[PDB]
Each structure stands twice: as C-alpha cells, then as structure tokens.
Design an enzyme around this catalytic site. Structure first.
Site, PDB file in Angstrom:
ATOM      1  N   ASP A  35       0.797  -1.139   0.045  1.00  0.00           N
ATOM      2  CA  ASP A  35       0.153  -0.113   0.080  1.00  0.00           C
ATOM      3  C   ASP A  35       1.041   1.310   0.007  1.00  0.00           C
ATOM      4  O   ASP A  35       1.462   1.708   1.153  1.00  0.00           O
ATOM      5  CB  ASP A  35      -0.956  -0.109   1.210  1.00  0.00           C
ATOM      6  CG  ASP A  35      -1.887   1.217   1.289  1.00  0.00           C
ATOM      7  OD1 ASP A  35      -1.823   1.966   0.335  1.00  0.00           O
ATOM      8  OD2 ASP A  35      -2.312   1.380   2.312  1.00  0.00           O
ATOM      9  N   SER A 199      -0.605  15.825 -11.748  1.00  0.00           N
ATOM     10  CA  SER A 199      -0.951  15.367 -12.960  1.00  0.00           C
ATOM     11  C   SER A 199      -1.186  16.651 -13.926  1.00  0.00           C
ATOM     12  O   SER A 199      -1.697  17.580 -13.398  1.00  0.00           O
ATOM     13  CB  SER A 199      -2.165  14.522 -13.202  1.00  0.00           C
ATOM     14  OG  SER A 199      -2.485  14.173 -14.488  1.00  0.00           O
TER      15      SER A 199
END
Ligand SMILES: C#CCN(C)Cc1nc([C@]2(O)CN[C@@H](c3nc(-c4ccc(C(F)(F)F)cc4)no3)C2)cs1
Length: 330
Positions: A35, A199
């Site tokens: 994770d 992004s």
C-alpha cells in the site's frame, strides 16, 4: 541489494493485489497488500481476536527465533474505506522477493474491522508511503522500504501491476525490459506523507487533451481512480446510460456498454488507461448495472491515482533525497 516479488490480484476484479512476504525465522509467508498510501506493516497474527480471523494466514511471533516484542509500542490505523486495525508490535526479519530487512517493525493485529475479516486473501498490509505516516506509538517506526533504502542498489521501488493478471514489485532497480518508451519523472510533495504529485491533465477516449493541474497521490492500496467531479462527469457523460447513484455509492453504467479510454498527463507525457480497465463488473451478482472504475474524489478530499490508473503504467517510486515519481507506458 535488490528484491523482486510477484503481486497477484485477489479476485477477478483486481480489487486488490497480494504479494508474498517472509516474516521471522523459520520464515512465515503471509500475503500482504502493498500500500503506497499508508506506512504500517501489519499482519493477522496469533494475537488477533479469534472471532475476527476467517481463513487468513497468521504470523505467530512465539514461533520465530528472531522476533522481539517492541515493548510498550501500540498501533492503530484507519483506511479511506472506513476499515481499521490495531494492536502491538514486534521486530523481526522481513524479506520481500529476496531482499531482507532485519529489525523491521511487524505490527501484530489484536483487532481488525469486518472488511478485513471478510477478505480471507489479505493477511495484512505492507505500507510504502513515507514513514512520517506510521502509526506506532510512542516510537514511530520506519517502513520496509525506508529500512531497506540504504542497502539498495538504487533508492527506488517500482510497481508494475497487471490487468486481471499478476505483476511485479521490484526494490532497488529499474527493469528496463518492463516498459515501453521512456519513463517521465515528476516532482513529489511529501508534506502529507504520500507519494503526492500533480498530473498535467486528461483526455476522454479519442478526445483532445485538457491541460489542467490535478494534485493527487499514487496509491497502490486504492482500487479505483478518484478524480475531481468535473473530470469524472466529463468521462461518464460519454457512456450512454451512465449515472451517479447515491444508493450504490458512485457512478454506474450499463454492463452492455463499451467504455472509452481515459488518458492522464505526466508532465508532457501521457498514460492511456484502456476502457476495459474502468469496468468493475456488476454491482451485485447478475445485475446489468456495472460499477465504474473512475469515481469522484469530492467526498474524500484528495485525488487518488489508485490501481485503475497505476496498472496502466510502469511506476517508479524514487525515494532519493528529493523524491520523485516516474511513469512509463507498457
Ligand atoms: C476518506 C478519506 C480521506 N483519505 C483517508 C483517503 C485516503 N485513503 C488512503 C488509504 O487508506 C491508503 N491507501 C488505501 C488503502 N486501502 C486499503 C485497504 C482497505 C480495506 C481493505 C479491506 F477491505 F480488506 F478491509 C483492504 C485494503 N489498503 O490501502 C486507502 C490513503 S488517502
């Protein structure tokens, strides 16, 4: 040193991926969910409340010659879905794919919430976010990656998740045969303890690219792709009959649909998620309503590039002094 381990989807939907991890002496192999959105290595154990164990493999520290109680240390963690676990702490030898850390904090669960009990395939979690998020008290502990970093050939790990197929976690090296083209690296902020990046925008299907900054985290422990409501609406608007359902908890679409791809920007580069990766199948067995793999982040407060996005790429988690993230097509 390096390590390399295969990671395997737990079910036909890629709901999560499990990677075998050797703990203790002689080795006890448990299948852990790696994770990158948390920083605790915790396991089902001989200490876990018996009624909360249902088919998991347990770590038994009393059978490990290298286990030592980390006296007085406790841990308690929650996850974004509302699941949780807590317990005490041992140090022991932990190996992933041939890479060994001695003295790793292995957090032994005394209690787990129902979703963990119900997932017989997940024996625990191995956190790979920054150690500042680790929940051990009163002495915070380091992640497996943080402990291994100084010994690695290069201070990196990579995630190469498969679509309905196994993939690979590598530590300490970049497998140049595992991706096409070049890896585009992008800056990381560690201020929240995550692999947080920005992004450069998105496209839906064959549409033109929309240049827009989308802060978010690269999180191998989250199944889906969570993005701003504007972006998610623009995606699902292209799918006849798709709608957000409050009763289901997100966007659903007719199982008869063929989904458009979704592109996200990494600097001037682009990662294309095929439409099929966004299909999470019937909301319940036999239903003709299917659950979408792109969902709104509006209720959670953070955009999450989970497995739907990451499995379309070869992803480098660069833990150098200035951390960065790399993405390549594959
Ligand atoms: C809400 C909100 C705001 N923020 C907390 C969202 C974020 N949430 C995270 C994570 O907690 C870390 N990464 C994800 C992760 N979830 C799991 C997981 C959960 C449940 C099970 C089950 F079902 F077996 F119980 C298995 C694995 N593993 O990793 C989520 C980071 S930011």
């Amino acid at each position: 040193s390096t390590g390399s381990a295969t990671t395997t989807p737990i079910d036909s939907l890629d709901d999560a991926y499990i990677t075998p991890v050797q703990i203790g002496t002689p080795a006890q192999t448990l299948n852990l969910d790696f994770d990158t959105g948390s920083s605790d290595l915790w396991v089902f154990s001989s200490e876990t409340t018996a009624s909360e164990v249902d088919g998991q493999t347990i770590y038994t520290p009393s059978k490990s010659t290298t286990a030592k109680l980390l006296s007085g240390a406790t841990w308690s963690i929650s996850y974004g879905d509302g699941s949780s676990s807590s317990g005490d702490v041992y140090t022991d030898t932990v190996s992933v794919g041939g890479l060994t850390v001695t003295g790793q904090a292995v957090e032994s669960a005394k209690k787990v919430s129902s979703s963990f009990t119900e997932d017989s395939t997940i024996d625990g979690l191995l956190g790979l976010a920054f150690s500042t998020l680790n929940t051990v008290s009163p002495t915070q502990q380091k992640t497996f990656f943080d402990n291994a970093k100084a010994s690695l050939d290069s201070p990196v790990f990579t995630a190469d998740l498969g679509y309905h197929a196994p993939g690979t976690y590598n530590f300490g090296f970049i497998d140049t045969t595992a991706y096409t083209g070049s890896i585009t690296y992008t800056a990381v902020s560690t201020k929240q303890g995550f692999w947080e990046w920005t992004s450069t925008g998105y496209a839906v299907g064959s549409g033109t690219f929309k240049s827009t900054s989308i802060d978010g985290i690269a999180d191998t422990g989250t199944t889906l792709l969570y993005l701003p409501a504007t972006v998610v609406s623009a995606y699902w608007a292209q799918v006849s009959g798709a709608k957000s359902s409050s009763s289901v908890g997100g966007y659903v679409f007719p199982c008869s649909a063929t989904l458009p791809s979704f592109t996200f920007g990494v600097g001037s580069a682009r990662i294309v998620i095929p439409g099929d990766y966004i299909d999470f199948g019937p909301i319940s067995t036999g239903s003709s309503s299917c659950f979408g793999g792109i969902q709104s982040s509006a209720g959670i407060g953070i955009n999450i590039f989970g497995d739907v996005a990451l499995k379309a790429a070869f992803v480098v988690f660069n833990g150098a002094t200035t951390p960065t993230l790399g993405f390549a097509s594959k």
